[PDB]
């Protein structure tokens, strides 16, 4: 059916295809990494530096190239900050490991030779370790904020993030319970951070405008039920043999509707959030109880209000309990101008944290949260694992001069492998200098001397003139990141290095 | 640019004469049937019309003229 390229003649097309993807990420590095406006389909149009989204909305034909663009999101989920770097390392990792393929005996001697690398390197990556207090996290959360368009307000965000992290609030914080509304307009400094849940939910009670705008000390009931004339789940049919059993049936309708809310007001409710809309009848019978009612709330949303309020979502009101109602301070539906929005906050010891932002167009805002997430997450990485690494590419240069040391101290024909892994890690800071040059190259040897007898830390500044010292500078990347970024970078190359043939068709048979 | 492309217009003596002399057509055909030495006509519309009625209406219905005048 189709041909296939095999052997070195192809082994190459695998490598140079790898380098290819990384080439489009060199600009992105923390310092002056310029934003990239990527037009995509359908009509999507994004702009930023976040690797796992600048590559995500960028399709690639080749196999190898498709493995790289995968490590991007393969990394972002695990730590969520090593987006731009993992690709830049994975790629360059093969470029300086290629001429040892043909000149080297085999592609498998290099495999074993890489294990002794990642092992040793992860070790050196552990030597430069710092301890997180668990206020001071604001020191590290600053760094995630710094690359993207959050620097202008590096402060404002660092707090808005470690705060959202702070609310929940479990040994493991799931950002699934941390909604992020993104209102357009105002000022980027106007991005408050409610301790409840913000809803586009307009003036609740669609019957009339009678329901309270906001209530002090509301006792909420969140329901997944329907709150409308229930229909027989078991396919039933009616037979009006009588003469006026029609009016009586019509009554049985409005009846069950009243009996519905009847047992729901018994929980002294003054505000109810039903996932599903409510019938006009049951919209009135309870309305006389001065109780608010908002329907159409999202499944996920009614889980944020499940922790904020404190009440447990229950089905079939008949078996309702006092432990189902909650305690939240207020519910005010302030207008965002032209568009409504019901706010709900308060309640002690509440996990949910909806951080509404502001600034410019919906797109501007996007890139804000886009990088905000990089922050929010970067703090959990440091929170679940309380220890950090000497950033600024210093950590990189360290494992480079350390492995490099192991180089000569190796007696074997596979020496030319460990070497490669080293030389490639030096390139991590390389662009940091090349992004703020000229010139990157002169500063290289500077760190080599410093690392040798200049102590572990001390890397390249992104100001940037050139050499500096990160502990002094204040750029510490959570070890967790650098740890996996290197690991993700090395292993993928190993799988790809294990390949020597490419077939161009599938059965699947 | 108006007018829309395309719809025919005859301004002038055109329609003034190309409507009378155009109406004259159907009025030139039937002008033979009348009176004792009559001239009945036959005509096959779409499908086998095969109808031969000397009723001037019955005739002028089958011509199905398209001209306004």
């Amino acid at each position: 059916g189709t041909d296939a390229s095999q052997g070195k003649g192809q082994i190459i097309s695998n490598i140079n295809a790898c380098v290819a993807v990384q080439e489009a990420l060199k600009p992105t590095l923390g310092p002056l990494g310029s934003d990239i406006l990527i037009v995509t389909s359908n009509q999507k149009t994004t702009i930023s530096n976040d690797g796992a989204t600048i590559l995500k909305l960028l399709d690639v034909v080749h196999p190898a190239a498709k493995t790289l663009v995968d490590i991007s999101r393969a990394q972002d989920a695990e730590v969520g900050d090593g987006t731009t770097s993992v690709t830049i390392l994975a790629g360059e990792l093969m470029k300086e490991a290629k001429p040892f393929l043909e000149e080297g005996i085999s592609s498998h001697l290099i495999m074993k030779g890489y294990r002794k690398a990642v092992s040793l390197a992860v070790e050196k990556i552990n030597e430069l370790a710092v301890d997180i207090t668990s206020e001071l996290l604001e020191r590290c959360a600053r760094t995630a904020m710094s690359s993207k368009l959050i620097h202008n307000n590096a402060d404002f965000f660092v707090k808005m993030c470690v705060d959202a992290v702070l609310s929940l609030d479990r040994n493991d914080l799931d950002d699934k319970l941390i909604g992020i509304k993104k209102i357009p307009g105002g000022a980027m400094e106007e991005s408050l951070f409610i301790n409840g849940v913000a809803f586009k939910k307009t003036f609740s009670y669609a019957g009339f405008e009678q329901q309270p705008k906001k209530f002090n000390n509301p006792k909420i009931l969140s329901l997944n039920v329907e709150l409308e004339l229930k229909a027989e789940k078991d396919n039933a049919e009616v037979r009006v043999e009588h003469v006026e059993d029609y009016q009586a049936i019509v009554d049985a309708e409005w009846q069950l509707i009243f009996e519905k809310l009847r047992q729901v007001e018994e929980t002294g409710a003054n505000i109810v959030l039903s996932k599903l809309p409510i019938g006009d009848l049951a919209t009135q019978f309870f309305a006389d109880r001065n109780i608010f009612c908002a329907g159409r709330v999202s499944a996920d949303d009614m889980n944020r209000v499940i922790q904020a309020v404190g009440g447990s979502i229950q089905s079939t009101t008949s078996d309702i309990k006092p432990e189902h109602l909650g305690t939240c301070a207020l519910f005010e539906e302030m207008q965002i101008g032209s568009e409504r929005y019901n706010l709900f906050q308060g309640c002690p010891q509440a996990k949910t944290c909806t951080l509404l932002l502001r600034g410019g167009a919906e797109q501007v805002i996007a890139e804000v949260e886009r990088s905000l997430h990089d922050a929010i997450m970067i703090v959990k990485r440091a929170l679940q694992n309380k220890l950090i690494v000497a950033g600024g590419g210093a950590t990189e240069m360290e494992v480079s001069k350390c492995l490099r040391d192991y180089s000569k101290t190796i007696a074997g024909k596979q020496q030319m492998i460990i070497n490669a892994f080293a030389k490639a890690l030096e390139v991590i800071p390389r662009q940091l200098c090349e992004n703020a040059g000229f010139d990157a190259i002169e500063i290289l040897n500077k760190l080599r001397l410093a690392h040798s007898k200049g102590e572990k830390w001390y890397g390249v500044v992104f100001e940037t003139e050139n050499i500096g010292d990160n502990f002094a500078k204040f750029v510490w990347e959570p070890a967790l990141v650098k740890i996996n970024a290197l690991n993700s970078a090395t292993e993928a190359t190993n799988l790809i290095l294990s390949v020597d043939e490419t077939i161009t068709n599938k059965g699947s048979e | 640019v108006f007018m829309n492309a395309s719809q025919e217009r005859t301004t002038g003596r055109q329609a003034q004469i190309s409507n009378i002399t155009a109406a004259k057509a159907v009025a030139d055909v039937i002008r033979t049937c009348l009176g004792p030495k009559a001239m009945l006509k036959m005509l096959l519309d779409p499908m086998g019309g095969l109808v031969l009625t000397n009723d001037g209406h019955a005739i002028l219905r089958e011509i199905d003229v398209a001209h306004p005048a």
Partner: protein, 525 residues
Amino acid sequence: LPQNPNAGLFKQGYNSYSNADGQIIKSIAAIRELHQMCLTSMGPCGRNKIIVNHLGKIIITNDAATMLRELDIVHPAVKVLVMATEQQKIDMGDGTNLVMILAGELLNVSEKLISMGLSAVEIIQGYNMARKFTLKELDEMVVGEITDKNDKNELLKMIKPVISSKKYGSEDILSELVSEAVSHVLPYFNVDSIRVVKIMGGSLSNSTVIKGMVFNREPEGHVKSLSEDKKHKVAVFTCPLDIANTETKGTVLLHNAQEMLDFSKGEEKQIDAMMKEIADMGVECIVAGAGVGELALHYLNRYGILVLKVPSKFELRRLCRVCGATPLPRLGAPTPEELGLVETVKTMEIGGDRVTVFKQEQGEISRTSTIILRGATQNNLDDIERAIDDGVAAVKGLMKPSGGKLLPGAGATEIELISRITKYGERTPGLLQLAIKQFAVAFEVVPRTLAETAGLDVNEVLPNLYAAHNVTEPGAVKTDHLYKGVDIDGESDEGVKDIREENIYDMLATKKFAINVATEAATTV
């Protein structure tokens, strides 16, 4: 080898820009295209142009608001002055031509002013300040005694010019039917009630007006219907005449023989029961408006009761307002306070068509009447109903005080205005002088347009009228059927005032929009 000029600034697909001055020259002409076509249409001694619908239907009119109604234009500018005439024919019946005529001309004359050096903003304020002076000046230029409305005296005097404008030559006979159908509505009055029903056969002069609407339908009940009565009392109602059918789910179930053997009978019972009940009430005629049941129709034919099939929901009303009765859902339970007396409900046939009627009233006299127009051409009979609806709209204005104020039409006023508007701009300092002296000569339309219609040497008609400012009324006009220039006063020819004011405004309003726009960004497809 080259070359090729690149594109200065790109955009989506294709779009059309228009430099404002260029567009004005260019779009002022598009406008001018439909002008020469609307000129010959206005006025009695004019012409009518045929139009073939995008569906193939054939249409002939004198009315310019209809010419465009059947016309599919493309020019966004022309679209405006078309929206004008159309946005008037609805609010005010007549005057649809004076709209285009002025509008077009206003633009035509404004050109000179735009080329001289003026600016669109300057041109606008100029014209505007004239619209306020031309509207007021006319409010007093009347001199036409606001005749009080009674009988056919004042009606026929006004309703004629509204008609003699397009359907010239039948002015007399025509309007006669109009005023006729009018005086059958006891004086707030509704224009809509006077419906019209035209039927082929004979010449137009054989048309008639009957007190009550005509139905091109036969009486139901087959050969069991009377189709001929005398002073019968009628009772109209919507609900289906047949059995009481289940509006919701409903069928018929039977368990035992006794059930079946009797269910067939039960129907018959209720049927007759319902019918006779309404028949005893003295009901001589049942006008079904919705649904008819053969099952129960068995009853109604035998006693001797008529039955008018179910018209349209909207036609039942105008009918009821003739009888005197009132519609009532649900069958049975008739109320004498809801019954109505109808003079005659016979079945006459014109042009060989089975037809029932309500003609003449002893009697209660109908509140709505219809005109029966006999003719020989589907097209003409249609552009006669138009010349009628125009009239029906003229009686709609005279019926709302104090619009019953006459005014020297026939160009008379549209000529005196020439000078009266000149003076205003003659004594108003600034650059706006020109923009006014133009708005004045703009009214040269109505004068010339009348003359050019009759073959009258326009170079004589105009000068004559200018000399004849007589101010007797005026007192001065032009009738195509004489020599030199005629006298409005004599012919009893005068155009209602308010109609002219509406025309003089909608034009000065539209003409301003066209002037106001500078760039037109038209899309594609």
